[PDB]
Amino acid sequence: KTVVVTTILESPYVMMKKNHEMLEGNERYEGYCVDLAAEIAKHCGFKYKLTIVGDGKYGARDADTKIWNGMVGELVYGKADIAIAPLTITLVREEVIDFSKPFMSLGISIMIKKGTPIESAEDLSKQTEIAYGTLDSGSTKEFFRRSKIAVFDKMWTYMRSAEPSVFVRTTAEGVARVRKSKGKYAFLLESTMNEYIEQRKPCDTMKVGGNLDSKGYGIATPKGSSLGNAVNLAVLKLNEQGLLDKLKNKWWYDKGEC
């Protein structure tokens, strides 16, 4: 049967085409993950329907209700057959859903407005003049919340009680905050998005320092799903064929605006 794909609106992975009001179904979307989905489907021999996750979240378990939300939840509760998006492979998630080998590598990074006197996480941790935060949900927020590393623990201690809140709901919001804060806000986000934004007008942001960690995005399926094996092989095959690199250049650098 037709495979239900859950994804999320996150540039340049999945974006609404400017003329989406004129289009229907899968044709409404474009981006790295839209292209990858087509490639995976072709190599696994299935037809599919792209759907945007209802709550706009990646996936976390509520500590109280213990209910999974986001794309992970969609897979766990059987609402979708596969998730093709910038979904970070983490221990807690790996325990409830199946992940293909990573199709892209990344690490947490720092985004600053050009000219901000910050070069590293250590720099940020030792001052308060420049506020800094992360998305209000997701693996980056959790990285800091759970970290036992001195510098990161110090940063989380600051972030969790900073007022006003240093957390943002979407990447777009964090970028807007960096751009409109006159250098007084630094955004902690995954290197992939940071690198993409650095090449977008008004070209006033930049990624600074090295990544704080190293991980990857994986295609996810419900635990035990028979689709898992085929998808994993397709990811490895596409990587070996250079297709993944081609898609990266296509959506990040080929049409960079800076």
Added chain:
Amino acid sequence: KTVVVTTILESPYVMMKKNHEMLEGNERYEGYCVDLAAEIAKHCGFKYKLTIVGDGKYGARDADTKIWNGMVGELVYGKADIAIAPLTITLVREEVIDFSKPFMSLGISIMIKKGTPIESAEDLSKQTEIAYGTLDSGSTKEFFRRSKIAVFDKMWTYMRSAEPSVFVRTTAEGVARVRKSKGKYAFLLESTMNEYIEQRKPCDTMKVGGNLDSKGYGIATPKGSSLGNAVNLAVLKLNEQGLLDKLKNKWWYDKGEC
């Protein structure tokens, strides 16, 4: 039996005493509503236990699940017997819980950092240099979201799509945002809180213009609760005795710091 009172941490209505770690039960709290609760209890002849609402919300119904949250939810689902807090009397709430006649009047107002070139809601609506927002929940946010009045509709249209978000989770956060935004953020909140903050150090904020609307706070009880009649009479009696005015001066002006 002992009456379970649900309330919320909102200065100067209910605040944790600085040495609360040394205290137990009702003695941990102080404020206008803590004093009012004692007065109402005495005049209604009941003993009570103050409890802080679990989700820290005032009360709204989820459009999807249709479940009430906040203090209103606590009353609707029988978790508390009465709510004594700065709970705004609104049509939607009046339909699900009982409200005493108002114990305090108020209106939505504008808080600015001293020196901000804004004198009214109209001023705010006609510009974008100075961002402005409200709490991310509650009657003030709903006032703008539902308003059919031109100026307020224009303001909501701006607020709902402004990036980064102009909404804050708590009053403290909004105040912090006004104070740290160098005049680039104006906070829309109820006049009562605005007036209180204006008299608190560092004395860098002020209420400007008249109130946008007029309403009041009421003591709430589960719909049909027998406690409702007594509480309403106590509110009227306390007002006529001048007790409510005395409490207002006690928590707002007597010890003003500006």
